């Protein structure tokens, strides 16, 4: 029984009958979270950066921080 669909691009798991699609790509509500605090970006206001996606929470801190590294 070969059971393994492509699914999203994050966790690579089939998308339920109520997920989300970004940039013509299969994404999940949990996978569509910032690569920092893992916040639900879907529906909320987020910023897509060439590198990765950051929620208004992290973004603000990134664009406006004391020291990056």
Cβ atoms within 10 Å of 9's Cβ, excluding its own: 13
Minimal distance, residue 59 CB to Zn ion, in Å = 8
The residue (of 36 and 47) whose beta carbon lies closer to Zn ion is: 36
Q: How many CB atoms lie within 10 A of CB 15?
A: 17
Query: Shortest gap between Cβ of 22 and Zn ion (angstroms)?
Result: 11
Smallest distance from the beta carbon of 35 to Zn ion, in angstroms? 8
Continuous segment of H or E residues that includes residue 21: strand 20-22
| Positions in the binding site for Zn ion (CB under 5 A) | 8, 10-11, 13, 28, 31, 34, 36-37, 39, 55, 57-58
Helix locations, 1-69, DSSP H: 56-63
């Amino acid at each position: 029984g070969s059971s393994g669909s492509s699914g999203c691009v994050k966790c690579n798991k089939a998308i339920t009958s109520g997920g989300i699609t970004y940039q013509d790509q299969p994404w999940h509500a949990d996978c569509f979270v910032c690569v920092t605090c893992s916040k639900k970006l879907a529906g909320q206001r987020f910023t897509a950066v060439e590198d990765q996606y950051y929620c208004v929470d992290c973004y603000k801190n990134f664009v406006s921080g004391p020291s990056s590294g």
